[PDB]
């Protein structure tokens, strides 16, 4: 059966993908991370194997598991916007340099790599819907250091493309658009997964801090239920008819567009109607402080995966906030 190597498994994507792969009885999951508290349920599973590892510290030990497995998913990256400008060099060394090693491990041993690109790769693209194959990528001048993350992830996509064009590297690049659901990542976790903006809103509700609406909270974002997201990711792993080879696939729900303002009001509404609301501080209000599109084209997901998002916003909003409130440490 197929050996799947998940680097950075102790988190949002690693938990949901491991559960999906383990449901089918033809996958061997090798989850690599420095901890396992977020995937404690799978350690006893006969087809899950935890690997102690850190892609910054380990080289030989990561190379061995790339050769040992069949498909690799490198999910380790600092994907939190405040860190792009605060620690730009650490963001660059981890997200780019360390992952380039794993990429090159995959071409060396002729393994298939399913690499998480970012939706920030489109930047300030003028298209209403972001096309993986046609949309232009627009960023600001280099004196605006916010873009160091978007430009770094883009160069990694191009280097993967070059290895596929020139060294026969089998790859699929997927770009998640605001994934949310049970088991969100930590706000400062160096694991690619849950939409950092929406978990910050829920943290505002849980902690009793106001919801900061940067310049109005009008910039809109298209969020996706992890049930819909992990389903498309699982089908990329399946690679039916090899239709995903060399492809770039957005994985988002373009019918779930909402501004940061509308997100807060939506989460707040579900917040008040929740049975556990009394355990949390009163709502602190919306504060105005000092990229606006981010709608994905999902034709590539239609073509390569026969995938269409099915869950409705209200279901996704209620379930993400519900799971959060019951698993919050009150003591």
Q: Are strands 257-259 and 179-180 parallel, antiparallel or unpaired?
A: unpaired
CB 51 within 8 A of CB 31: yes
Lateral strand order in the sheet of 27-33: 48-52, 27-33, 2-7, 71-74, 112-116, 171-176, 247-251
- How far apart are the C-alpha atoms of 297 and 311, rounded to whole Å? 18
With tokens 């008819």, the residue in question is: 241
**Which residues neighbour 37 within 8 Å (Cβ) at sequence distance 6 or greater?**
10
Instruction: Take residue 140 and report the two structure tokens written for it.
Output: 């600001």
Q: Looking at the chain, list the stretches that DSSP marks H as alpha helix, in order from N- to C-terminal side.
A: 12-23, 60-68, 81-86, 88-92, 99-108, 148-166, 196-207, 226-238, 260-272, 299-305, 313-326
- How far apart are the C-alpha atoms of 70 and 3, rounded to whole Å? 5
Active-site residue list: 120, 294
CB 230 within 8 A of CB 176: no
Q: Which residue, 126, 131, 151, is CA-closest to 296?
A: 131
**Which residues neighbour 156 within 8 Å (Cβ) at sequence distance 6 or greater?**
95, 96, 99, 100, 103, 115, 117
Distances from the Cα of 6 to the Cαs of 115, 242, 295, in angstroms? Answer: 11, 20, 28
Q: Which residue, 258, 260, 259, 282, is CA-closest to 271?
A: 282
Fold of 2-194+224-253+292-309: Rossmann fold (3.40.50)
Q: Which residue, 174, 175, 200, is CA-closest to 188?
A: 200
- Long-range contacts made by residues 150-153, C-beta under 8 angstroms, separation at least 24? 150/118, 150/120, 150/121, 150/123, 152/91, 152/92, 152/95, 152/96, 153/77, 153/95, 153/96, 153/117, 153/118, 153/120, 153/121
- How far apart are the C-alpha atoms of 153 and 92, rounded to whole Å? 9
Query: Diameter of the chain by CA atoms?
Result: 59
CA dihedral 201, 205, 207, 208 (to 10 degrees): 120
Is the CA virtual torsion 31, 36, 37, 42 positive or negative? positive
- Long-range contacts made by residues 52-61, C-beta under 8 angstroms, separation at least 24? 53/7, 55/7, 55/8, 55/94, 55/98, 55/99, 55/101, 55/102, 56/93, 56/94, 56/98, 59/101
- The interaxial angle of helices 99-108 and 60-68, nearest 10 deg, is 40
If one counts every other C-beta atom within 10 angstroms of the C-beta of residue 23, the result is 9
Backbone φ, ψ for residue 171 (5° rounding): -145, 160
Half-sphere exposure of 113 (CA within 13 A, CB side): 32
Instruction: Take residue 112 and report the two structure tokens written for it.
Output: 């298939």
Q: Are strands 48-52 and 224-225 parallel, antiparallel or unpaired?
A: unpaired
- How far apart are the C-alpha atoms of 303 and 133, rounded to whole Å? 13
Instruction: Take residue 177 and report the two structure tokens written for it.
Output: 């658009």
The neighbouring-strand residues paired with 30 are: 5, 49
- Resolution (Å units): 2.8
Backbone φ, ψ for residue 253 (5° rounding): -115, 90
Q: Which residue, 146, 143, 144, is CA-closest to 82?
A: 146
Chain centroid, CA 105 distance in Å: 22
Spell out a b/e string for 65-84, using b for 16 or more CB atoms within 10 Å of the CB, else e: bbeebbbbbbbbbbbbeebb
Distances from the Cα of 78 to the Cαs of 19, 89, 105, in angstroms? Answer: 24, 11, 21
Q: Which residue, 306, 316, 303, is CA-closest to 226?
A: 316
SS3 227: helix
Spell out a b/e string for 297-326, using b for 16 or more CB atoms within 10 Å of the CB, else e: bbebbeebbebebebebeebbbbbbeebbe
Q: Could you say which DSSP state residue 281 is in?
A: P
The neighbouring-strand residues paired with 33 are: 52
């Amino acid at each position: 059966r197929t050996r799947v190597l998940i680097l950075g498994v102790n988190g949002f994507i690693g938990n949901h993908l491991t559960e999906r792969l383990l449901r089918e009885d033809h996958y061997e999951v090798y989850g690599l991370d420095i901890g396992s508290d977020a995937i404690s349920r799978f350690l006893n599973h006969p087809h899950f194997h935890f690997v102690e590892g850190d892609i910054s510290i380990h080289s030989e030990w990561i190379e061995y598991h790339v050769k040992k497995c069949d498909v690799v998913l490198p999910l380790v990256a600092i994907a939190t916007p405040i860190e792009y400008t605060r620690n730009p060099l650490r963001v660059f060394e981890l997200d780019f340099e360390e992952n380039l090693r794993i990429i090159r491990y995959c071409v060396k041993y002729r393994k298939r790599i399913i690499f998480p690109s970012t939706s920030e790769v489109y930047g300030m693209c003028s298209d209403k819907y972001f096309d993986e194959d046609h949309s232009n990528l627009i960023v600001g001048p280099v004196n605006k250091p916010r873009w160091i993350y978007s430009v770094s992830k883009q160069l990694l996509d191009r280097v993967i493309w070059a290895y596929g064009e020139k060294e026969g590297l089998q790859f699929t690049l997927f770009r998640p658009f605001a994934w949310m659901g049970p088991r969100l990542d930590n706000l400062n976790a160096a694991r690619i997964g849950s939409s950092r903006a929406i978990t910050q809103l829920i943290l505002n509700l849980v902690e009793g801090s106001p919801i900061k609406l940067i310049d109005g909270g009008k910039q809109k974002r298209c969020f996706t239920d992890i049930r819909d997201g992990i389903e498309a990711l699982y089908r990329i792993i399946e690679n039916a008819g090899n239709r995903c080879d060399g492809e770039i696939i957005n994985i988002g729900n373009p019918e779930n567009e909402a501004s940061i303002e509308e997100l807060g009001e939506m989460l707040l509404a579900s917040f008040e109607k929740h049975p556990l609301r009394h355990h949390f501080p009163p709502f602190a209000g919306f504060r105005v402080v000092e990229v606006e599109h981010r709608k994905p084209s999902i034709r590539n997901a239609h073509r390569c995966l026969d995938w269409e998002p099915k869950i409705d916003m209200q279901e996704t909003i209620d379930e993400t906030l519900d799971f959060f409130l019951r698993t919050v440490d009150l003591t």
